[PDB]
Amino acid sequence: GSTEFLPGSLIDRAEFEAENRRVVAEGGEPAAGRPVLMGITKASLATDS
């Protein structure tokens, strides 16, 4: 919608819920998301550093 996200990506739950609460509080749009399961190499190669 209007949450500044690319549909198909993998984002953290904390950031996702923070963005969903921030956006609806001012403009209003809920993004969609289903839980996912990853490996131990894709979780290690997708860190924030």
Side-chain angles (χ1 to χ4, degrees), residues 16-31:
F16 170 82
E17 66 213 7
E19 186 93 354
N20 263 38
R21 192 249 333 289
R22 204 278 322 277
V23 153
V24 303
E26 178 71 51
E29 198 268 335

Side-chain angles (χ1 to χ4, degrees), residues 5 8-9 11 13 15 17 20 22 43 46:
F5 285 133
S9 37
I11 47 158
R13 212 174 288 131
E15 300 182 30
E17 66 213 7
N20 263 38
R22 204 278 322 277

Side-chain angles (χ1 to χ4, degrees), residues 8-11 13 33-39 42:
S9 37
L10 308 150
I11 47 158
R13 212 174 288 131
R34 314 309 310 266
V36 86
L37 186 85
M38 338 180 60
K42 261 173 35 60

